[PDB]
Amino acid sequence: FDSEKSGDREVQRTMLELLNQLDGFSSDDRVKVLAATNRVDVLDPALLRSGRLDRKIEFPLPSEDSRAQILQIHSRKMTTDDDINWQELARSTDEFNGAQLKAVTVEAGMIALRNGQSSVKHEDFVEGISEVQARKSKSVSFYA
Amino acid sequence: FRNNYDGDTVTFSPTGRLFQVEYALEAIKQGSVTVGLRSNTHAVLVALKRNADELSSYQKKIIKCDEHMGLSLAGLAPDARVLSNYLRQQCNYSSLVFNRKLAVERAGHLLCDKAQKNTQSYGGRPYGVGLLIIGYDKSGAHLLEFQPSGNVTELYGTAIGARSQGAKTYLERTLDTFIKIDGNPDELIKAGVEAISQSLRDESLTVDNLSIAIVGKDTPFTIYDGEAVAKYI
Amino acid sequence: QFNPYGDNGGTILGIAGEDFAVLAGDTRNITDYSINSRYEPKVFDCGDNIVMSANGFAADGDALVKRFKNSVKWYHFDHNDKKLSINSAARNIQHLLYGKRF
Amino acid sequence: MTDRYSFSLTTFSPSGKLGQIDYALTAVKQGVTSLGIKATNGVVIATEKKSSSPLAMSETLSKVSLLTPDIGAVYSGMGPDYRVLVDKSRKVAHTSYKRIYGEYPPTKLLVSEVAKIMQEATQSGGVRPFGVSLLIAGHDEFNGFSLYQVDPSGSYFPWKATAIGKGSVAAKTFLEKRWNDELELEDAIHIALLTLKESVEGEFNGDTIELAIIGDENPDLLGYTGIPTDKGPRFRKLTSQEINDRLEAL
Amino acid sequence: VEFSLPDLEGRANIFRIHSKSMSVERGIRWELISRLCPNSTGAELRSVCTEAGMFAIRARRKVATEKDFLKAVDKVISGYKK
Amino acid sequence: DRGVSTFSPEGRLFQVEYSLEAIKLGSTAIGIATKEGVVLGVEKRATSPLLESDSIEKIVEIDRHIGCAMSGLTADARSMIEHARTAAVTHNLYYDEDINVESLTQSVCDLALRFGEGASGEERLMSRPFGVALLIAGHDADDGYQLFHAEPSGTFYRYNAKAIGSGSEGAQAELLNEWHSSLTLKEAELLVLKILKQVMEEKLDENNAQLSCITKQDGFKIYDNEKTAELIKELKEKEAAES
Amino acid sequence: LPNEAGRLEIFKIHTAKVKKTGEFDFEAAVKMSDGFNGADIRNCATEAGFFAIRDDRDHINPDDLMKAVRKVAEVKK
Amino acid sequence: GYDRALSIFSPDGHIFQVEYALEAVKRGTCAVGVKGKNCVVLGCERRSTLKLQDTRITPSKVSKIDSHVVLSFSGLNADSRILIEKARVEAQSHRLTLEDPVTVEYLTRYVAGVQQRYTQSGGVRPFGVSTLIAGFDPRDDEPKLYQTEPSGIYSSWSAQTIGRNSKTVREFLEKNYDRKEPPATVEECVKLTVRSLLEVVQTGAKNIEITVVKPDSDIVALSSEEINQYVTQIEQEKQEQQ
Amino acid sequence: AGYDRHITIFSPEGRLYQVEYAFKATNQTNINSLAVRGKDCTVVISQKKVPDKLLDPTTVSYIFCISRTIGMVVNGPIPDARNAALRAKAEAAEFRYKYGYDMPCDVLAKRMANLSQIYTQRAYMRPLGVILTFVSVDEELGPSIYKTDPAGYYVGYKATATGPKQQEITTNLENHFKKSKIDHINEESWEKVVEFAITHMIDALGTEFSKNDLEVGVATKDKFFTLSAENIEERLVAIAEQD
Amino acid sequence: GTGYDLSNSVFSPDGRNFQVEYAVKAVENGTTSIGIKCNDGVVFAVEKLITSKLLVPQKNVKIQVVDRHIGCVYSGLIPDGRHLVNRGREEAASFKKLYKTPIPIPAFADRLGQYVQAHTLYNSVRPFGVSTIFGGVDKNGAHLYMLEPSGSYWGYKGAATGKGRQSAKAELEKLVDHHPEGLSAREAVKQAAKIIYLAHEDNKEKDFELEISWCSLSETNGLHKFVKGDLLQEAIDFAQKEING
């Protein structure tokens, strides 16, 4: 909103046109526009109007039911010993996201790789969680 | 940025509360697993004691505040002591002034206020320690959860420390059964040990890690310490 | 004007023996010719094999005792339930007594 | 909880200057043209009256305050800083001298007392320093009539005429030339209107000049019409009509 | 993956490993060299073996000695400070 | 400057972490508690002809039953000693008896919490925490011979043996193997000398080492220069005959 | 910022082209805003309409309209 | 409130403020003390470059702490007054209360203690001074020499040197002293002290101030005349060892 | 120090950022005020609106009665307005005991100004945002209007306005007073005084306002009263009785 | 802009400090609580969230008493709300002693107001992030008040705050209109319960447990008492009758 908005012209113009064009044709639903980012950035007003990008949709984090479904999708793809309880593992992981439950499956397999197993037991997954997934990992029990 | 709102304890941030406060809630999980459970006539506290070495001797995770009261800590030690002295002081005065033992509820609400004051003070800090405080007053058996930002909840059962969610699943099932056993100490106690070993998944249980404390209608603050916890597994 | 200090009578007797000791006291409590109590324990167990009686004036007894009861409690907390010695308790009282003389 | 601020807010910069004093001075340069003259047969001080509004009283407004009975002060700078400062100066002047030595403080002694207030405030934190400069024009019966400057830091120096505010230097040139001592008070009033007409253009009146003199007595300024016991005030502020009369007097 | 701060047993192994290739004259225990580090990074360790060799070359030597290794620890850590 | 109430995402304070950094730079202090005594030994270090090396020692007596050896900054250990003497003296007057080593560590640790800007919980008068850790050794008639490690953070643990200092990583490892539950005072002191020799880059003399002991017929007793040297004399010959 | 008068006119205009059960009280709707210009008002219209696709209809109640203006207000300014 | 921080940790386990205190001492003048087994000698610089100083009211470097005890320093004079004052009071406090003349060890503990406080305690910074404290204990004929830093640490030393080119003066001294045979006679121990301090003052024989302390309050400051004589001699010695 | 708007200290320019921002956006809270002087009354009209039907508008207050005779009109927000009210009230009461006399507008204005100035220099407080117009019919000066503003500046008025229809109000009164050769109108009854006020108000802000959209405070000799809702409509209808 | 996000000891150009904005936000991030003024009284009701069966009923009620006749309920964060009240209590005990009369609801608004406002003149004290709805009956009529975290407060006819603020004002505004102010105190419990039901529709991730209390000069006699038993039970039924689902 500063006087560096001068330099950043090319970006004001691409956006403006795409919006001007959507409201131009707002009654007809043919084209959808979706923009994606980690987090909301400074922009020109456009969240105030049906024909622009009206809707502002939040992603929260998963919960126990959600982690467990995500684990059942994971467990089709790869072998398991068919004993693994998503609900129980889900209690054992705190503040995990979907991508991170997928990295536990990889680490569970890295235990398995060392062990000489081709499947994973419950233990194999528990140990996988202990190792890094790089954004959050439940393993805390240190303090004397 | 992180570094912008972190430096002193006097700022709110768009999140609704300060970053530092969340880091105090996080520390509790680092420290020792302690489960809390009650029926309606007695209330039981089970705690895992950890040390650092073979040639180290245990640090006590139960600190007895009265002959009808005690608490468990989980998290930062130095604050857990500064708090247990305050609770001692609060208790005694009640007895000296009002002839009163000090209710769990009554204590919780005084402790909360102390916690707001140390989170508006800029040099001051969150304590960084959560506590499970148990008692039997003339309000009945009690378990309270104290958090170091002033959050106080009365519960049937709960856990703080290593995989709290872990123990909580166990307790929530076996709940309806054990809590209607009212007048048998031993059962509720036995459910406590059965629970705590299933929260564990990168530790194991043993006799001299475990320590149990019970308070109730006919049990004055008594610890089973070392050997004597074997007969509750 | 005012001095609350008087007397309330009563009698206590302590005997050290071979392995044992007694603190015998009557249970009558007076103020002049009126009966305050006809039973009121005038020997009281403070704990730790220590029994104690402050005969004389009641008003000071009650005070002396309350200061001391909280010391028995604080000695235990601060030193992990290590029981209070008769000699140590006697020193602790000395300091209490000496703490008011104004 | 509560303040903890005790770190000085006035600090040295790489050159040997003091940031806060430098800032404060910019305000003073931009403030209202004020001057002071010692006529030798008196002292006349003039300052700009201003109005906020035509529907606003300027009786309440304070551009000339009597610090002690024989002494007036005027300023360029920051109005709010001036008002509080006048107050602490009045208080100490009354408590510590007016039945201790049995009279007002001498002018030089009062300039030092102001100087101290400003310096306390510059040394110590919790508060920023005063942003003001004063011209303290006076009479004391043990030093005659005097003119001093009081700086923002509390540095002071003696003067026999000066001006501070906007457009100072040229105002001093006209004053330097017209007055060179031994001059009637009346005449110094005339010279003062002339210096300020050349200094302020756009609209000029004696209803936008507020003029005070220390340089008269009435029985009314002994404060009684009986038998003298003491001399009393010599401060007298003129009304607007009297000033227009001196504007008519060539 | 860590490449931050290793252990005493660990510092010893990395010292032992760079000095194999070198000739040396006897009286070296790696443990002693390791002892003088209150905290290191892998960069610092590489600097102790190579610096220890330099004191020897100035005196004109092919061998490395217990004295040299100590001398190289003292220099490197102290410069790292601040 | 640096926050005094600002924690890591884990929840471990900066100031605590920084406390741990000064400790690691002192000379080793090693304690073994046995069934006849507590041995505390230090490396004093430095030998120079322009130095009086037998006028400085790192084993200071608190009381007629309590010592401490330190490791880390030595200037800091003076404030810790001044607080500790006052607290022990006042308790001996009130109840006529020995103060507990655990009890002492808690009283001291309470005043280790002040640093920085004040609180409304506490009046914080200092600027940093203490940069020394201590092994406090004693005797009490109600737990016998004991050995304690006080960290300046707040934590204090009872031990049967513990080493602190720069060279603690090795030292501790040796302590365990040498440690058993029929260990005595006389053996323990000889063993201390073994450990100290091993880790030195010098010859062990009593102008770079000092021993001390606790017996309950004499309280805390400094093993003097004359005796410590006689023990060193006996070591060198016996070791140098196993080769 | 609009008037109370500006909001009313624009609510009435937007719901005129729209199909509805029931006469609508635009006057409540205006209270339920505080300074919505025509674009903000349109988001409220469609919002009501969303519960009507769900209620399997091309009409909307008064009842929908009160809820709708408030949910849009809360999700921004 | 100004009890808040003003001295903070280093990440290296030093303290920033103590590292910076030692630098002021180095830039500074040089003070030295060398021991016999009959005396303790203290040399102190007075390198007056300019000739417009009047030197009977130009500050000295020698203070009485007590009648049998001296303190010398290298560092800011301003800070050193504040320490010097607290140390005189402490000698008189003991004297009053214990009915006993002062012992050197306790005084050293005291000097150490104020400096130690000001690093630990908030809204104060340590002094800009390192000191040497020496003297004799009562009824005692053996020399005592202590060194204290503004870190607050303390040690005994057979000899020690401080301030500018401390390295150079230690290194020299090390070749001319043994603890097994230290000097018995005042003349030769003084000769050595004047010779070390010549080598760093540059030109100096009135710019060097010697004060020799013998047991229990025999404290005597040798003069220019005497010093010029030892420097002559040193110029004869250096062509007997050529 | 810090900075010039993270704590209150001079700007680069010798200005104070905090006082100028205190002038601006504290009158844009849907408030506009005027005060005019009667013959034997003082009239204030001030806007005062309620945006809910569920907000009881009686408690809604922005003309306060400081004493039984003194009124204070606040332009600016209720958190600030009550810090100034508490001070005003206290000052009024204190004055009454100590000096034995009712509190003049001018004395209250002057005292509050100097106090705000001190809070302006402080580095741990703000100047209040509020603009305070103090009204009564003094027996020591007649009808009076004295206004303080937030910088520690204050000055007396004979008629004043605030909010950005200041120019409109002023010009209508100025032309009027230049013609009649008086700055006070002459009429006894309060009723006719409020009608004079409205005439200049309606023209100047270019609108008329409802009963619950106005709040009118009248100063009389030894009373200050606010007009009930019906009473404020009575007046608006009474000019329209003429039409 | 800046400095006003960390401090309160200086004044924003917006007239509204960024730190103050963040304080309001945490209020909307709590639970729903409401307050109903009626033709003789006030009735207070709150939604208490049920998460697990490890929580115990009526010991984690968010209704806290001050004095005898003031019931105080809040939205936002728990610790802020309790400390704010504990201060109310202390002023209330002081009041009662000194003036020998109970503390007013208007007085108490001021007491709270001045503690909040004090922390919004200082950067060295951090203010409260709760909105507290309170009221009662006193010597000078019935009062409902709402305290917001700026240190803004007024008396209202009706109030809501929290997550469910909007839905609650809608359902309340219809019922108050229909009635003169909210009819009888009896009626008001039934009305209240309908309001909580509509307000629940913004939660739907937790079940709730209904808790009401009242202060009434015609059916309690000027005391604050809980509404439980028969009266609560008819109220659950009334809500579930008209509001379906």
Side-chain angles (χ1 to χ4, degrees), chain A residues 129-140:
Chain A
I129 292 168
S130 294
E131 296 293 314
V132 174
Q133 293 79 10
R135 183 174 177 180
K136 186 182 293 186
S137 179
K138 178 70 175 179
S139 63
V140 175

Side-chain angles (χ1 to χ4, degrees), chain A residues 103-137:
Chain A
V104 171
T105 298
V106 173
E107 291 297 308
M110 293 299 166
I111 295 297
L113 178 61
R114 183 178 64 195
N115 288 339
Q117 301 296 303
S118 64
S119 68
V120 179
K121 295 181 179 179
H122 182 71
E123 290 177 350
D124 288 345
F125 182 95
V126 171
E127 292 297 311
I129 292 168
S130 294
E131 296 293 314
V132 174
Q133 293 79 10
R135 183 174 177 180
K136 186 182 293 186
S137 179

Side-chain angles (χ1 to χ4, degrees), chain D residues 3 5 7-11 20 22-24 26-27 30 52-58 60-63 78-81 83-84 87 126-131, chain I residues 1-2 7-16 106 110 114 117-118 120-124 141 146 151-159 170 173-174 177 183:
Chain D
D3 66 19
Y5 291 98
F7 182 78
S8 177
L9 298 177
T10 299
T11 188
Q20 292 295 305
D22 288 346
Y23 287 175
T26 299
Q30 294 178 340
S52 294
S53 180
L55 297 176
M57 291 179 70
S58 60
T60 298
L61 184 66
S62 178
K63 299 296 183 179
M78 182 181 289
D81 288 346
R83 289 181 183 276
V84 72
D87 289 346
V127 62
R128 66 177 175 90
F130 287 107
Chain I
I7 61 172
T8 300
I9 61 172
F10 288 116
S11 69
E13 296 80 60
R15 295 178 67 188
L16 299 174
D106 191 62
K110 290 176 70 70
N114 287 341
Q117 187 276 329
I118 292 168
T120 299
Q121 294 179 334
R122 292 181 183 272
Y124 60 85
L141 180 62
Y146 299 88
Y153 179 98
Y154 63 93
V155 65
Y157 298 86
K158 295 181 179 179
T170 298
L173 292 173
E174 182 179 333
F177 287 170
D183 294 322

Side-chain angles (χ1 to χ4, degrees), chain B residues 2 6-9 20 22-24 26-27 30 50-61 76-79 81-82 84-86 88 117-118 121-128, chain F residues 2-14 102 105-106 109-110 113 115-122 124 146 153-162 172 175-177 179:
Chain B
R2 182 179 181 274
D6 292 316
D8 63 21
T9 301
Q20 291 178 28
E22 183 65 21
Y23 291 156
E26 182 65 19
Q30 291 176 334
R50 294 181 176 88
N51 63 17
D53 206 341
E54 293 178 351
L55 298 177
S56 65
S57 296
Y58 289 114
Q59 179 69 55
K60 293 181 179 180
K61 302 296 183 182
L76 296 175
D79 289 289
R81 290 192 297 272
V82 171
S84 66
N85 287 339
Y86 289 166
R88 290 185 184 94
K117 290 180 180 178
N118 291 333
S121 175
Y122 73 63
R125 64 182 176 85
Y127 287 119
Chain F
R2 296 181 181 182
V4 298
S5 60
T6 300
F7 294 86
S8 67
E10 290 177 350
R12 185 175 70 188
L13 184 66
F14 286 114
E102 182 177 1
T105 59
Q106 183 177 44
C109 293
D110 289 345
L113 295 175
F115 62 70
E117 293 182 356
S120 65
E122 65 183 303
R124 296 180 181 180
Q146 297 288 332
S153 294
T155 59
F156 63 92
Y157 298 87
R158 180 173 64 87
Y159 299 74
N160 292 319
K162 186 176 182 180
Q172 291 177 334
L175 290 172
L176 181 61
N177 288 339
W179 182 93

